[PDB]
Amino acid sequence: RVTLDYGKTGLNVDLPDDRTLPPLTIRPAPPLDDPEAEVVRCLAEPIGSPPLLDLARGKRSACILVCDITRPVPNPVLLRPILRTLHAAGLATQDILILVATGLHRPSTPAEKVEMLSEEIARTYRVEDHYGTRLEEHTYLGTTPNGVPAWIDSRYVQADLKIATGLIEPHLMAGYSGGRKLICPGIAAFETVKLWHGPRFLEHPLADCGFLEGNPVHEENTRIARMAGCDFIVNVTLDGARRITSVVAGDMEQAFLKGVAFVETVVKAAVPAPVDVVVTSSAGHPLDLTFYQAVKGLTGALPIVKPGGTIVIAAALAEGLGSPEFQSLFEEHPTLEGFMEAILKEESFTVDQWQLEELAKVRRKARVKFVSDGVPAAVLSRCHVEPVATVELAVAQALEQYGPEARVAVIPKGPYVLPVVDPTL
Ligand SMILES: *C(=S)c1cc(C(=O)S)c[n+]([C@@H]2O[C@H](COP(=O)(O)O)[C@@H](O)[C@H]2O)c1
Ligand SMILES: CC(C)[C@@H](O)C(=O)O
Ligand code: NI
Structure with missing residues (x-):
């Protein structure tokens, strides 16, 4: 059985x-007893970043990327500490956008936003969806050496403070989910994603679960995410029963790679x-x-x-x-x-x-x-x-x-x- x-x-x-x-x-690593308390600690002492409170000083607007329904991120555990820190830093709730990084998925429904973010957050903050087929909602940031144009949601591009949250799991194209993937493809236009998810990338033998270095999918969405920027990430890993087993916060590449180094062991x-x-x-x-x-x-x-x-x-x-x-x-x-x-x-x-x-x-x-x-x-x-x-x-x-x-x-x-x-x- x-x-x-x-x-x-x-x-x-x-x-x-x-x-x-x-x-x-997966290997039975110990869950964190108090993952929200751990998020708080990691915001004060992050990887490759200043503390979030210091990053947020003097910022007028913030955009926080969250995964859509298809990722079981325990978003309130990550977001309540982030949102407290932003409020402490002087940003008003009206200055903060929570942007659902749908990629090319359909928009989240009102009920899904409550399921994803908790009723309290979904009712208090502006929560909007990315629409990848609407090029007019995107800003062009340049074209990569591989010829992929970078079109990223303008609400994020124009925000003073850029934050992304997510979940590090194996991914059949990008090796692992998380970090940079909240930007590319999470808030990238079809004009970008159609090429990045094109057969020239997807037929590569390392465009597969578990591969980062040498996987052109990962090299390219890292490059595109860096053209947009991301001031701060918070990522988790989950065990089979969906308990948080690790929290990484800070630099979009260094914290992501620390989380991957852990998840590879389990x-x-x-x-x-x-x-x-x-x-x-x-x-x-x-x-x-x-x-x-x-x-x-x-x-x-x-x-x-x-x-x-x-x-x-x-x-x-x-x-x-x-x-x-x-x-x-x-x-x-x-x-x-x-x-x-x-x-x-x-x-x-x-x-x-x-x-x-x-x-x-x-x-x-x-x-x-x-x-x-x-x-x-x-x-x-x-x-x-x-x-x-x-x-x-x-x-x-x-x-x-x-x-x-x-x-x-x-x-x-x-x-x-x-x-x-x-x-x-
Ligand atoms: C990864 S290739 C990916 C692709 C899509 C497409 O529509 S294509 C959408 N997403 C969404 O982007 C967010 C971050 O992705 P991650 O793999 O969880 O890091 C998340 O909301 C995904 O559903 C990703
Ligand atoms: C299923 C794949 C192609 C993408 O849509 C994702 O959610 O990871
Ligand atoms: Ni995708």
Whole structure:
């Protein structure tokens, strides 16, 4: 028996005792007893930055970037200390904007802002959404040597004090989330993101979970974030039960890299050899709201599945497939091969196409069996995965296909784990 992450509930799965490896879990580091108290300490004694109170002295306006619903940041723990310090520094609440760094996602709803930030904060401060398809809401900052123009939300660019908050987890393109990613793509225009999420970046072998140095995705969004600037970040890591295990604050690069150095010691989970069947999740609510995001569970499993193996994913998909643009690509391109011909041979850019490219990367290596009650089977079958009614059935089907030597690995927290093959094991 194992509980996979699945919406707000989890999912209780029975897996074959004689076939299944011990579950891949992140290392059990101690949670912080008082993470808000720790945030307070880190604001007074940050990494590579003056104390936030000293940074905020004499500033007339502030913009605080926060993640949208898809990231389970415990925002009030981070924001209450920040907001207290800004008030102490003399900034009035009307001088402070909380900007939801949607990237190219849809805007957060009023209810989501309350879920993300607490009723007290959502009611007291101006909270606005980034709109990536609205170029007019962005300021041009220059073009990188790789040819990517930097278009960043003007409300942030024009703020006296720039602050970003977030969460360091593995990421299938940028290696890890957090730090600079709140700026690029969090408040970057489609004119920027379409190129940065273009196949010239995404087909690179190091554009993958866990890779920073040498990953052009990370080199480029670091460069673009530095063209905008960021005076101060606060980032956390979360364990499997969503307790904060570390807080980093200060310089946008130095604090981020300190947080990554910690999370690298807990998120890696090794098997001695790749396996024919990998059971995984999309890390539950809120990440697994859409099929668009749940592709992350599929890419996360790739390092430990054998070529031609099967990934079995469970995800609640309570919000369905994703954006209208994302959904339209399945209708416009019934095969992944035709989709990849479209985007590889010409400069063809459609919102959210990058996740279809990631799904194509998955399907070049593995079959996928998809278990969900949030999207009908008939719909999922048009999404280049095989809908199966239960994980237990899906595993039984895969084990018959691969035979009596086949083994099962299981990753209950899905893309929040970094599975690796360690032959020395
Ligand atoms: C990372 S590539 C990324 C991409 C998008 C797209 O729409 S593309 C959106 N976001 C959002 O930006 C915020 C910061 O990202 P992080 O990965 O959590 O550091 C967050 O609100 C993401 O949902 C990111
Ligand atoms: C799913 C990916 C492509 C992006 O939208 C993100 O939220 O990380
Ligand atoms: Ni993105």
